[PDB]
Design a protein around this ligand. Structure first.
Ligand SMILES: O=C(NS(=O)(=O)c1ccc(NCCSc2ccccc2)c([N+](=O)[O-])c1)c1ccc(-c2ccc3sc(CCc4ccccc4)nc3c2)cc1
Length: 164
């Protein structure tokens, strides 16, 4: 009794972040389990529509705010110990009062911003860790907000591309 797409907070973040790194050409060792996993074929026209919307959603945002999160990035600093604690401290501010499709878009960007921050130095593997925490906060907050507010289909339906 919950759609038939199987959207996974982990997968969505893994794809979005995976694309961000692709732009640079970094073969992010995401699917460490590279043993040919079919299960039910890669075909996912269902979650495919939102994959583009959500993927493009962040891009359009980053282009609008090119002097907000970029600066705060310097505050994050560079370290594996504080990195994990800094993430939660940042997202916490993303939604002080309440959550909304409008604010969540910034959520994805954050991960990508902090993710690349590690790659810039020499902590590519860390990119995987970030995604782990991202899904936690997204599933522990957003998920509940989206699930109660229609769901994923809402975002894509509300913010749908031209025609299709
Ligand atoms: O305007 C906003 N939302 S909206 O009006 O409801 C909207 C407007 C357009 C679209 N879509 C249009 C097509 S693409 C697009 C998507 C989103 C926004 C703009 C365009 C969408 N949406 O798709 O959900 C939502 C909006 C504006 C500003 C912020 C915002 C501002 C300062 C900060 S600081 C921070 C720390 C986390 C943090 C750290 C690092 C980086 C980011 C955030 N996060 C912030 C987030 C957050 C949301």
């Amino acid at each position: 009794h919950a759609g038939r797409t199987g959207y996974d907070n982990r997968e969505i973040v893994m794809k979005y972040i995976h694309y961000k790194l692709s732009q640079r050409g970094y073969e992010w060792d995401a699917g460490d389990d590279v043993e040919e996993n079919r299960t039910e074929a890669p075909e996912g026209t269902e979650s495919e529509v939102v994959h583009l919307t959500l993927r493009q959603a962040g891009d359009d945002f980053s282009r609008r705010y090119r002097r907000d999160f970029a600066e705060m990035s310097s505050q994050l600093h560079l370290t594996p110990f504080t990195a994990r604690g800094r993430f939660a401290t940042v997202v916490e501010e993303l939604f002080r009062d309440g959550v909304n499709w409008g604010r969540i878009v910034a959520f994805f960007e954050f991960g990508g911003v902090m993710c690349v921050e590690s790659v810039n130095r020499e902590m590519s593997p860390l990119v995987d860790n970030i995604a782990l925490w991202m899904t936690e906060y997204l599933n522990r907050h957003l998920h509940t907000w989206i699930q109660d507010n229609g769901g994923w289909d809402a975002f894509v339906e509300l913010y749908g591309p031209s025609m299709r």
